[PDB]
Write a protein that binds this ligand. Structure first.
Ligand SMILES: *[C@@H]1O[C@H](CO)[C@@H](O[C@@H]2O[C@H](CO)[C@@H](O)[C@H](O)[C@H]2NC(C)=O)[C@H](O)[C@H]1NC(C)=O
Ligand SMILES: *[C@@H]1O[C@H](CO)[C@@H](O[C@@H]2O[C@H](CO)[C@@H](O)[C@H](O)[C@H]2NC(C)=O)[C@H](O)[C@H]1NC(C)=O
Ligand SMILES: *[C@@H]1O[C@H](CO)[C@@H](O[C@@H]2O[C@H](CO)[C@@H](O)[C@H](O)[C@H]2NC(C)=O)[C@H](O)[C@H]1NC(C)=O
Ligand SMILES: *[C@@H]1O[C@H](CO)[C@@H](O)[C@H](O)[C@H]1NC(C)=O
Lengths: 50, 57
């Protein structure tokens, strides 16, 4: 394992889909909130949906 | 454009992700987008513009 900051790993993940990585940094708070909210929806989904 | 920024402690370089090869930061190695205010954890350094010493002759 080689350490790398998570906001910098996600920029590599964005280049890996052909989205130029400035699109992450210009939207980092939004992308973090969409991710945090989406993990929220997993808990609500699993907690209710047997 | 490709690779990642790194510092040896005193100087800033750009390097391909999978093998340490420190290169001077230039307008060829890098692309602009927007301005300083939006990016979390941006830093200040010169970016060398290779054309300017040619036109300085
Ligand atoms: C891109 O989409 C997101 C939604 O995922 C937009 O963010 C929302 O913006 C409104 C106000 O315009 C807020 O009420 C929401 O709470 C925001 N959601 C989140 C998760 O932050 C975003 O504005 C859109 N951007 C563009 C340029 O269309
Ligand atoms: C970081 O890299 C720079 C450039 O390779 C190093 O600066 C050079 O250091 C040598 C002596 O070690 C000098 O002869 C050069 O003139 C220096 N060049 C410049 C542009 O200053 C620097 O020493 C390195 N720092 C560390 C902590 O390794
Ligand atoms: C990067 O450099 C700029 C200047 O080029 C720094 O901006 C100054 O910041 C101080 C403190 O907020 C202000 O008093 C000055 O008026 C600012 N100058 C300008 C031109 O905006 C900036 O702080 C530096 N950033 C980092 C992370 O080192
Ligand atoms: C990095 O780490 C510490 C703790 O989170 C913090 O004080 C510092 O401001 C952080 N820097 C950036 C660029 O996030």
């Amino acid at each position: 394992a080689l350490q790398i900051p998570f906001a910098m790993q996600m920029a590599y993940r964005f280049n890996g889909i052909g989205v130029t990585q400035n699109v992450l940094y210009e939207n980092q708070k939004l992308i973090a909130n969409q991710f945090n909210s989406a993990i929220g929806k997993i808990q609500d989904s699993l907690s209710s949906t047997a | 454009r490709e690779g990642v920024f790194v510092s040896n402690g005193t100087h800033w370089f750009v390097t391909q992700r999978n093998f340490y090869e420190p290169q001077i930061i230039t307008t060829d190695n890098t692309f602009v987008s927007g301005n300083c205010d939006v990016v979390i954890g941006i830093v200040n350094n010169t970016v060398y513009d290779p054309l300017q010493p040619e036109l300085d002759s």
